[PDB]
Amino acid sequence: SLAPEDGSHRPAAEPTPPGAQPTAPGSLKAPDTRNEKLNSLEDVRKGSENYALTTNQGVRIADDQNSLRAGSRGPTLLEDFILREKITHFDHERIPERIVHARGSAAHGYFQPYKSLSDITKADFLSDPNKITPVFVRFSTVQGGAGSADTVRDIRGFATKFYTEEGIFDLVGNNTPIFFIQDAHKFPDFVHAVKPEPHWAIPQGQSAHDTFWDYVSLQPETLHNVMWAMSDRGIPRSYRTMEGFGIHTFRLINAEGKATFVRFHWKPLAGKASLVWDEAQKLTGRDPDFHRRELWEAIEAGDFPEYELGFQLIPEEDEFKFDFDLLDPTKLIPEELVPVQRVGKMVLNRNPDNFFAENEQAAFHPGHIVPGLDFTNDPLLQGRLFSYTDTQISRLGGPNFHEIPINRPTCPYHNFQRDGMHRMGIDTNPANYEPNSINDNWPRETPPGPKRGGFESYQERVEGNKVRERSPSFGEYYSHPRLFWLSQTPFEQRHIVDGFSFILSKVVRPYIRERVVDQLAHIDLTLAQAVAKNLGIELTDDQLNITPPPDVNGLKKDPSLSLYAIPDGDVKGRVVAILLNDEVRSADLLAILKALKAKGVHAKLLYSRMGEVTADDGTVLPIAATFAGAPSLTVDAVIVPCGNIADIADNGDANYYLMEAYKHLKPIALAGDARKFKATIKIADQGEEGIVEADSADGSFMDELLTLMAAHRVWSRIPKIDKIPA
Amino acid sequence: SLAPEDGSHRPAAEPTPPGAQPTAPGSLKAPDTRNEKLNSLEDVRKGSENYALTTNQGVRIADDQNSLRAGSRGPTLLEDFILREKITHFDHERIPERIVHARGSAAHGYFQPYKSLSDITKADFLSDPNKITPVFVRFSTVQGGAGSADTVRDIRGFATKFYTEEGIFDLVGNNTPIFFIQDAHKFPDFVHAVKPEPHWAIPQGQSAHDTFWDYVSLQPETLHNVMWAMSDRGIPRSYRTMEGFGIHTFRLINAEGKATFVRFHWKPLAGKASLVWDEAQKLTGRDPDFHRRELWEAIEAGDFPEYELGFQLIPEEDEFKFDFDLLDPTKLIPEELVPVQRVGKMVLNRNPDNFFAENEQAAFHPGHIVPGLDFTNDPLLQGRLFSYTDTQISRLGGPNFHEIPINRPTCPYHNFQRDGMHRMGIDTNPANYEPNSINDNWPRETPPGPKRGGFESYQERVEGNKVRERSPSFGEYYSHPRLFWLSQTPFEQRHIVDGFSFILSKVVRPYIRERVVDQLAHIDLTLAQAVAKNLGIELTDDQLNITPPPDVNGLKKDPSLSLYAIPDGDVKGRVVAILLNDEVRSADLLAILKALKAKGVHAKLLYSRMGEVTADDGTVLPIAATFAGAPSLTVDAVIVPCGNIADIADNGDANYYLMEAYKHLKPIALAGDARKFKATIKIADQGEEGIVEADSADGSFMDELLTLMAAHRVWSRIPKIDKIPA
Amino acid sequence: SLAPEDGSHRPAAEPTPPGAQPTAPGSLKAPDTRNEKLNSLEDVRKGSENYALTTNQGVRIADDQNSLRAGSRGPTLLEDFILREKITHFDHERIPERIVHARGSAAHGYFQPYKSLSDITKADFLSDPNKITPVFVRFSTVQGGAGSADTVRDIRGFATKFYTEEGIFDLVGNNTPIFFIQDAHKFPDFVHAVKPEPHWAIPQGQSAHDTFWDYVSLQPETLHNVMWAMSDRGIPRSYRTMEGFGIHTFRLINAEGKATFVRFHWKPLAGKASLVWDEAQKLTGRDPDFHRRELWEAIEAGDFPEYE
Amino acid sequence: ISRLGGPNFHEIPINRPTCPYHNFQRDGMHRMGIDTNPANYEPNSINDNWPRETPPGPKRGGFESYQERVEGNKVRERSPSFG
Ligand code: HEM
Ligand code: HEM
Ligand code: HEM
């Protein structure tokens, strides 16, 4: 038998910290985590243990190692149906990846409201706090292929499928509150410009190329989302630590028929946190699956991703009360003007069993609404409603994609639609049309109503000529980018400048760089000059003279637009690298591990080889990874306990570990003779804010380090990192 | 509520004769008819009564009569996701039809062996007479599309899927015991020659065109199956009244590893019966769905199609004992040489619920065998094994077609195949490869053995060089055609001559007709002369002198090759037209209807209009159809009861009804004054064989009519019909 | 050589009456008949005479009569790439038929206006009586599949693709001047009710069944087109002898921007003529390809279908 | 067949031979080539059997497999020489 005697092949079916066990299909890892959607998938889950290997026709296979041949050195025979079924299935495994958002990672969970919303919406899923709705959520990047890296600079997708009692609602959002373009007719142009260029299909997962910046320079409506992408919002630490937005204004409709405009928000209960660029880019090379891994291992540990759903609500009479058009998806609604009302909480608590069957095949579409919601005339939303139904026809093979298990509603569905490729449902209705007498008109229409009623559009007044024309109210491009800029902390503004500077340096045609700097000068001169200086460009007098755009309804900043201005840090689910030596001070390691456990912070024990080392008191410590195998890129903070520090003092890899973490603004803590490493990061004898140092690891050394971790990164260190060659 | 208040819209859920009630889905017509496969389809059967109409996402629809528009006379809006989901699904309802056998009709049933065959085969489904195997059978024509007519002249397909406990076994046969060609490499040539011609796509459902006979004239191997297609075997009365054959020699393998050669047969328990050509061709116009309809209505009546499986068995030591090669699919094995041993019984006892989902998506493939069976080197079989797997990947949309509910095994299936379009099964196995340790190598290979073993091929010796070469043993083309011809009755030989004569008359290029006639002269000079005379062709002295091919192992005829030489008539399930008048003798009608009921023979009451007529004694007679609506083509015999004959005596439709029935050799019975119709069909005063006549329908009138019905048709009338203008 | 000595295997490349010669591909039957669209298809026309038989990769085949096997009575070998290519292509011949109007018959031709219509429309194809526009036209039935019969009782389609200098215009019409239903939302209902019923897939090519009349009886907007279908309009003699209509009101827009409402009509220059029902129905059995054949043969004879 | 959408992938321009190709195969999704041969089968007489098979030869001949000797039983077995 091939499994090891000791049973160490099999992960424990209990939550465990990252790296402690091999990861596993969600139903094997967490068999008692259930919701109505996960339970309904039971009819299609297939096991394996104790079953005979068969063909797809149920024929048991005797020899799965050899083709059938004429003699054991002879030709393969065409009658080998076993070989050919197995190779045919393999030959046809792939399906088209998504046209955008092809790279994505997904989990099961549930949603529950905090109170009934029946005064604003008759949506059944929001009617009662004890109504639990299963969800399936997929997070994604935008530009790269399904095989591209996770920690690129990109917008991120945040798509949620609610399996409600009155239908599937998909909330298909992103991690920034606006889009790049105004009208869906432009989407193939913008997407072509950002995707790999058509001659040579370079670059992957990057906007750092001429075509993108050509389009941006000629389409200033893109400048607002460009500012977000260039900020640290473009490189989140985790899907758990980014915001989500629906972007468009939609409508809530109550049982009285009153419409309220809404924009949707997701607020991360782990707080907001992003990488820095150098770290992000390096992480695409050292772990291109970092975000997929982080999400799966968080759920396996019980560090469930949690988000609060939020609504910005604007009465119908206030449609024209702002400086910008509510229908314009390049404009955000500042939370200073319209606060976010917190409406419920979503928890993602179970990984899929099979990536392909549940994540790759999942189909989300913003036109999947339910009674109690309605659309608006936002012209980007309007065109999206067409695109998602259409693309699913080729990507998923035909018009029965709703019968793919992950996409099936959990509520009833009955109608007169029939056939299509890979039809699963076998209809018994004598009628396949209505009106019909032969089945007494079943299934029947249902009038709209306050609950379980049929869908009826809000009777919005339409008045105008049939025109292909952009609303003049959408023609203002610079005041939102300026508001976002002025709402950033000084360090966030510096990262924006550096984002633009690094990227535009990779544009080959210099006039495109100059055209973009000209657009920046319409937003903010300080920004425009700081980017220009890095590109060797000089602003003209005309450019130094452009009048700033106006404030937004009297606002010259909104701190809700910054990642870091208002503290919201949570250390639960973060990870620290502990750099070991061959006789660790065991009292340091006890203290550290204890303090980390108390806050839900994981640790990884690192050394120069695998296996184990022995602590001063004889404790055997198991090594998780090498210095070079689990780089500082992958952790939040680094601790070096006392002991035989000469063992690692001259280890290039250990030195570099600390140089890299320092450069990336991560908290570092040094105990006892570990303080010899201060030399490598150039720290004055008297200490520096963000380096924790003491004679040993006592309770106070840990409180200080965990305080640095709650603030995420040590922004005050930025002017000091220039001198470190890392 | 649109249903009539009397509930007449819904058919009774109990057996009823053809036409008595509207037809229905099999689970609503016969809910208590169950088998293991029909029970396993419960998970995908969808009802309808009492359910709300929804989108495929489960959203209730309020108004399924209107698109969303800006104003009730305004333009339709892109945001109507309900209109677009409904039209998108409709727009994608069609899938490719089968490349051959596109037109076919199917039903569910079950099979049981009469005794255990474990001495000759370890096949589980043949191991125990109390083992019931569910089946799904599809009957088909070969050339025409899925919308072509049923009663064309063509070979028929007879495909049976056995859902066994050790795997699906598909026995994919035809209604003749040989095929047209020897090696699969020719199959696209042959099928292209018989299909509609490629410039204009004509003719549908017919071999009566130049390309077919061009290929035949140049490929004498085809002549044997051509003889059968030109005979009345090419125009079966019903799928219930044709034979089936697997054509190829296969092997049975027993638990001791002994191989026995086998050819598969199905014998129709209802007997063998065919139409005549003019009737068949007329019926393609008046009811192009006649065989589909007859199959479905026989099942709803309780007249279940029954067939007996039988095997012709030949020991391995006797492979070379015949004048023909066992591996040559253009050669039959005469039952006089190798008798068919009865093996078991198949009953088809339930119709599908949804034709598309179950019939159209069904996939049969002769490579689907189970342990206990194996292949031989028949070069036509060997190529089929490649084709069915391949075609199904495009027809059914991908490699997961075994997950379509009709195709699923009822036994366990587990393996390491993953993904593909339309993937339903969600695999939870940690491993997707073997050998593996992480799942202790499950699912595991199973050694071969007497029961529940893995499949291993019979270790047949192969010896020879890699060649593209036809075996010289296959190089004989005329002896089997001659054996078939000499085995037919004189009236069957007349119909074969008429078959060739009518069909070659449609070949436009006369030299092709002359080439076919020359091939006939190598089969039998009497056949060749009779066909030449009809075509205005004179055989040359050379042709008159071709020597006949040899007898087949000493045989000069085998009566098992004729439809009619050995009586096997069965009247149950047949149908008689009764031509009413406005004052029917009610005592005639009582005697006629009860005698037919007692033998399971159906009746259809016909008149010149719909509604009712009233018999001499006041009995109200409900009319099934008019004389034009339900022509004689659709019944087996015609009865005219006494009454007011002058009512119908001058009705051109009634007279022509009898003229057509008479021409087509059907029994006709005339009571009382109905004898006045003797002048219409030119019957002598003292009467003639095949016309039943009496003063009333009492005494022996119905027994005499039923005796004629058991003989099927009045062959003795053939020389009398040439004169009547019908 | 397999052809007969006298050359009678090959139809004359001149106009001939129906039945005088075997029918043939248009470019072989009428090589001097050309238009801009027929010429443009030259890049993809493939001949055959004097060429070697090859795989799709251009490899010449020596023996197209046999699979590769180990001995001449032995098993077929997986390395036979010639057999597998030929059988792969055959196995993948079919594509889905059209959801409606799956049975149809088509020909090439040309159009030209009698006079410029520039007062009412700027459409370039209507701008000059001497500017000829190629067309491709398909006629069809509605309900039956691609292999159903021609002379059923049904509405007929009349679809014309005009290959204009300013883009393709498709006029996709039928042979009666109205449709059965008012709103496209109901089309899948109406089509389902007319098509073969879902349990047993019967009847083909026929509205003579319960579901269709159930729908009609509950949707009186259907009655107009039902009248046309029940008249001898439902059974035309030929596609040359029926009317065509676009059904919907469309607009014409001239250079000054003026809109005029328009309905489109085709008038058959051969006249209007239909079968009688007993004839139509028997002809579905004796020649289910009657209209397809009659159209192709009229064109081979020089009796070109003409419409106004 | 599934990656490139059907059996006519040799007609996608990059995959096309530059040398002649002619046979009796027809149809399939995405069919570009418009065949004018009156026959779509062989042997035929109606187009004098063209396009025709070609015997093997030193240049420009038909493909024939090398006539390697095959001898053994039908087995699913690795050759011991591979172990
Ligand atoms: C506010 C603007 C938009 C946002 C927030 C948005 C968000 C997303 C997200 C999150 C996904 C990935 C869903 C998944 O995980 O499977 C997605 C996929 C997609 N988006 Fe959008 N998108 C926007 C605009 C558009 C526009 C204007 C179009 C086209 C008109 C479009 C067409 C698509 C298509 C074709 C896919 C692939 C869907 C699939 O294959 O199932 N997107 N988008
Ligand atoms: C003894 C000779 C043969 C018999 C008895 C036979 C019988 C049949 C039958 C009954 C069907 C229809 C199964 C159904 O109802 O779905 C069928 C379909 C098929 N046949 Fe065969 N056949 C023969 C030879 C061949 C050969 C030589 C090839 C190709 C090498 C072939 C390729 C096909 C294909 C592609 C289909 C359609 C299968 C599908 O789409 O699922 N047939 N044949
Ligand atoms: C005025 C009413 C209509 C007329 C005159 C009409 C006419 C036709 C004709 C002549 C064709 C066949 C074109 C060809 O030869 O390939 C066709 C195909 C079709 N029709 Fe319409 N039709 C009408 C209404 C509709 C409606 C309301 C819909 C759906 C909303 C529709 C959907 C289709 C579809 C899906 C096809 C198949 C087209 C293809 O596969 O290329 N038809 N129709």
User: Which amino acid would we find at residue B668?
Assistant: I
List of chain B residues whose C-beta atoms are within 8 Å of the C-beta of residue D71: 462-463
Residues of B within an 8 Å Cβ radius of D: 188-190, 192-193, 197-199, 210-211, 214-215, 217-219, 390, 393-394, 398, 421, 456-468, 509, 511-512
Q: Residue B504: which residues within 8 A CB-CB, separation 6 or more? A: B213, B512, B513, B516, B517, B531, B535
Contact C93 B76 (CB under 8 A): no
- Which atom from ligand 2 is nearest to the alpha carbon of B173? 5
Between CA B236 and CA B233 the distance in angstroms is 6
User: Which amino acid would we find at residue A699?
Assistant: G
Contact C80 A78 (CB under 8 A): yes
List of chain C residues whose C-beta atoms are within 8 Å of the C-beta of residue B184: 67, 76, 83, 87
Question: What's the CATH architecture for A24-409?
Answer: Beta Barrel (2.40)
What DSSP character marks residue A442?
-
What's the CATH number of domain B573-726, 3.30.750.210, 3.40.50.880, 3.10.20.30, 2.40.128.20? 3.40.50.880
- Name the residue among C63, C76, C186 with its Cβ closest to that of B379: C76
Q: Is B101 one of the catalytic residues?
A: yes
Tokens 């297939």 belong to residue = A46
Burial class (CB in 10 A: 0-12, 13-18, 19+), A32: exposed
Minimal-distance CA residue to ligand 1 atom 17: A101
Contact D75 A69 (CB under 8 A): yes
Contact B462 D71 (CB under 8 A): yes
How many angstroms is it from C100 CA to the middle of ligand 3?
Answer: 7
What is the chain D residue with the closest CA to C89? D7
- Starting from the edge strand earliest in sequence, which strands make up the sheet with A625-626, in order? A625-626, A602-607, A575-579, A637-640, A668-671, A691-694
* Resolution of the structure, angstroms: 1.6
User: Chain A closest CA to D6's CA: distance in Å?
Assistant: 12
Length of chain C: 308
Backbone angles phi, psi at B427, to 5 degrees: -85, 135
How many angstroms is it from C113 CA to the middle of ligand 1?
Answer: 47
Instruction: Answer left, alpha or beta for residue A682, where phi above 0 means left and psi between -120 and 50 means alpha.
Output: left
Beta bridge partners of A625: A606
User: Chain A closest CA to C82's CA: distance in Å?
Assistant: 13
What is the chain B residue with the closest CA to A425? B44
Contact C215 A433 (CB under 8 A): yes
Q: Choose one of B103, B171, B384 to mutate for the ligand 2 pocket test, by most ligand atoms within 8 angstroms of C-beta.
A: B384
Q: Within 10 Å of residue A722's Cβ, how many Cβ atoms? A: 7
Q: Cα D23 to the chain's mean position, in Å?
A: 8
User: Which amino acid would we find at residue A640?
Assistant: V
Tokens found for residue A386? 């067409």
Residue A536 CA: distances (Å) to CA of A500, A501, A527, A541, B135 = 13, 10, 14, 16, 80
Backbone angles phi, psi at B261, to 5 degrees: -70, 140
User: Which amino acid would we find at residue B299?
Assistant: I
Between CA A685 and CA A678 the distance in angstroms is 8
Catalytic: which of A56, A66, A89, A101? A101
Between CA A546 and CA A544 the distance in angstroms is 6
- Which atom from ligand 3 is nearest to the alpha carbon of C245? 5
Q: Within 10 Å of residue A149's Cβ, how many Cβ atoms? A: 23
The DSSP code sequence of B377-446 is --HHHHHHHHHHHHHHHHHSSSS-GGGSGGG--SS----S----TT---EE--S-SSSS-STTTTPSBP-
Of C161, C147, C56, C42, the residue nearest C102 (C-alpha) = C147
Residue C50 CA: distances (Å) to CA of C22, C27, D49, D53, D61 = 22, 18, 10, 11, 15
List of chain B residues whose C-beta atoms are within 8 Å of the C-beta of residue A437: 2-4, 9
Residue B396 CA: distances (Å) to CA of A5, A595, B507, B642, C24 = 45, 59, 37, 57, 34
Between CA A343 and CA A264 the distance in angstroms is 10
User: Chain D closest CA to A65's CA: distance in Å?
Assistant: 8
Catalytic: which of A174, A349, A359, A581? A174
Q: Is B174 one of the catalytic residues?
A: yes
Contact C198 B356 (CB under 8 A): yes
How many angstroms is it from C94 CA to the middle of ligand 3?
Answer: 21
- Cα dihedral value B450, B454, B459, B462, nearest 10: 150
How many angstroms is it from B322 CA to the middle of ligand 2?
Answer: 28
User: Which amino acid would we find at residue B326?
Assistant: L
Contact D72 A75 (CB under 8 A): no
Backbone angles phi, psi at B278, to 5 degrees: -60, -35
- Which atom from ligand 3 is nearest to the alpha carbon of B90? 35
Q: Within 10 Å of residue C284's Cβ, how many Cβ atoms? A: 25
Minimal-distance CA residue to ligand 2 atom 37: B98
- Name the residue among C48, C68, C88 with its Cβ closest to that of D1: C88
Q: Are D37 and D43 in contact (CB under 8 A)?
A: no
Tokens 């005797």 belong to residue = A62
Catalytic: which of B101, B291, B365, B522? B101
- Cα dihedral value A463, A469, A473, A479, nearest 10: 160
Tell me what percent of chain D is helix, strand and coil, each rounded to the nearest 5: 10, 15, 75
- Which atom from ligand 3 is nearest to the alpha carbon of C174? 5
The answer to whether the annotation marks A388 as part of a ligand binding site is yes
Tokens found for residue B27? 């689970």
Q: Are C58 and D17 in contact (CB under 8 A)?
A: yes
Q: Cα B622 to the chain's mean position, in Å?
A: 33
Top residue of C2, C16, C59, C94 to mutate, by most chain B CBs within 10 Å, is C94
Contact A71 D73 (CB under 8 A): yes
Residue A174 CA: distances (Å) to CA of A271, B69, B232 = 17, 30, 70
Q: Choose one of B172, B194, B242 to mutate for the ligand 2 pocket test, by most ligand atoms within 8 angstroms of C-beta.
A: B172
Q: Is B367 in the pocket of ligand 2 (CB under 6 A)?
A: no
User: Which amino acid would we find at residue D5?
Assistant: G
Q: Which residues line ligand 1 (CB under 6 A)?
A: A 98-101, 104, 138, 140, 157, 159, 172-174, 179, 184, 187, 247-248, 329, 363-364, 380, 383-384, 387-388, 391-392, 395
Between CA C90 and CA B186 the distance in angstroms is 11
- Name the residue among B2, B199, B383 with its Cβ closest to that of C76: B383
Quick one: how many helices (H) and strands (E) in chain D? Answer: 0, 2
Q: Which residues of B49-60 are buried (b: 16+ CB within 10 A; e: fewer)?
A: eebbbbbbbbbb
Q: Are A173 and A246 in contact (CB under 8 A)?
A: yes
- Name the residue among A2, A41, A54 with its Cβ closest to that of B413: A54
What's the CATH number of domain A469-572, 1.20.1370.20, 2.120.10.30, 2.60.40.1220, 3.40.50.300? 1.20.1370.20
Residue A563 CA: distances (Å) to CA of A236, A273, A480, A483, A485 = 10, 7, 17, 14, 12
Between CA B132 and CA A210 the distance in angstroms is 70
The experimental method behind these coordinates is: X-ray
Between CA C196 and CA C191 the distance in angstroms is 10
Q: Choose one of C99, C101, C170 to mutate for the ligand 3 pocket test, by most ligand atoms within 8 angstroms of C-beta.
A: C101
Between CA B231 and CA B229 the distance in angstroms is 5
Question: What's the CATH architecture for C24-308?
Answer: Beta Barrel (2.40)
User: Which amino acid would we find at residue B46?
Assistant: K
Contact D76 A63 (CB under 8 A): yes
Between CA B611 and CA B634 the distance in angstroms is 21
Between CA B665 and CA B274 the distance in angstroms is 12
Between CA A626 and CA C33 the distance in angstroms is 79
Q: Which residues of B410-430 are buried (b: 16+ CB within 10 A; e: fewer)?
A: bbebbbbbbbbbbbbbbbbbb
The DSSP code sequence of A673-726 is GGGGGGGTTT--TT--TTEEEESS--HHHHHHHHHHHHT-S-GGGGGGGGGS--
Equal fold, A469-572 vs A573-726? no
Domain assignments of chain C as residue spans, ordered by start: 24-308
Ligand nearest to the CA of B191: 2
Burial class (CB in 10 A: 0-12, 13-18, 19+), A560: middle
The DSSP code sequence of C164-214 is ETTEEEEEEEESSSS-S-S-GGGHHHHHHHHSPPTTT---TT---SHHHHH
- Cα dihedral value D23, D25, D29, D32, nearest 10: 30
Q: Are A317 and A86 in contact (CB under 8 A)?
A: no
